C-alpha cells in the first residue's frame, strides 16, 4: 500500500531500492540501482525509494560527488 516495504520479504542492499512497492499479492519486485549522481542509499532497506544526493553557493562547494551508496560530501561557515 505504501513505499515503506511492509509487504517486502527481502531487503535491498546499499546503492539499490525496490523497483516498485511490494504488494500483498504480486511477485516481489527486484532491486534496482539508485540514479547515479542524483540519488543514493547508504544502508540496506525495504523501500522503493532512494535518498536525494546533497547539494552545496551558500559558502560551500562540492568535495566528492554523490555515489549510489554515499551522499555528496561538501566543503567550505
Amino acid at each position, epitope marked *: 500500500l505504501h513505499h515503506d516495504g*511492509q*509487504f517486502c*520479504h527481502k*531487503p535491498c542492499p546499499p546503492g539499490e531500492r525496490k523497483a516498485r512497492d*511490494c504488494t*500483498v499479492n504480486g511477485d516481489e519486485p527486484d532491486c534496482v540501482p539508485c540514479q547515479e549522481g542524483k540519488e543514493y542509499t547508504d*544502508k*540496506a532497506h*525495504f523501500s522503493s525509494k532512494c535518498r536525494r544526493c546533497r547539494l552545496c553557493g551558500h559558502g560551500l562547494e562540492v568535495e566528492i560527488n554523490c555515489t549510489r551508496t554515499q551522499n555528496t560530501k561538501c566543503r567550505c561557515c
Partner: antibody
Amino acid sequence: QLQLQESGPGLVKPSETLSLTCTVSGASISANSYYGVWVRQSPGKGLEWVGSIAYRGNSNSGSTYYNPSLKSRATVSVDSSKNQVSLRLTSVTAADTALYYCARRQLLDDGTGYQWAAFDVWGQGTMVTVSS
Amino acid sequence: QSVLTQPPSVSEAPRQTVTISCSGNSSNIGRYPVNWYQQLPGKAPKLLIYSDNLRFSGVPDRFSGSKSGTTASLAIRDLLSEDEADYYCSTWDDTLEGWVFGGGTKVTVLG
C-alpha cells in the same frame, strides 16, 4: 501494547504434522497489516528463523516466505476472526524438536527517515518434542 | 554452524566490560544491518539493539552496538549480575535469501 502467545500439543510423533497457533492481543492484525514470523530454538542451541507471513486485513490475504532449509514442510497462515497466526510443519523428525516462538517483524525508524526490520515483539514460546 | 560466527562464551567480573563479536561476510553483515537479541535464562529473546547501533525501547546505556566491515559488535560495560544471559546477533543473508542468526554467546558475570 502488543502481546503474543503460542500454543501447541507439546508432543508429536515422527512423520506426523505439527500445528501451532499464535494469538495476538492488544491490537488487530486485520486492522491494516501484520508481518508475523516463527523462530525456533532446539534445547541448548541457537535461533533459527522458520518462516513469515505479510498479512493485509483489508483483502484478508497474506504472502508467505520460508527458510529454504525447511524444504517446503512449513506453511504459515492467518485466521483474522481469531486474531491468530498459525504454523503447520509436515513430516517431522527429531530434528524439529524445539521451543517455537512467534514474533512480529516491525520496520523501525533510525531517526533519519530510514527504517530497518527487526523482531520487536516475541511470544513466550511453546515447547515441541518429536517422539514416539 | 551458523553463517554468522559468535564466541560461545565471554565473561568478566562485575563492573567490567565485555565485547561480543559477530562476524560474517559480504553476503550478510557486509551489506545488511545487524540486530541483537538478549535471551535471559528461561525467558524468550528480546530485541536489544537494532540497525547496528540503535538501542531498542528502554534498553539501558551500558549496552551498545556497532558494525564495521563484516563484523558486528555488542559491548556491555559496567556489567551487572542480571546481564548474565545469551545474546544473539541477526541479519539478512542474500545468498541464502533469509534471516540468519549467530550461534549465540553466553555472558557470564564471574562470581
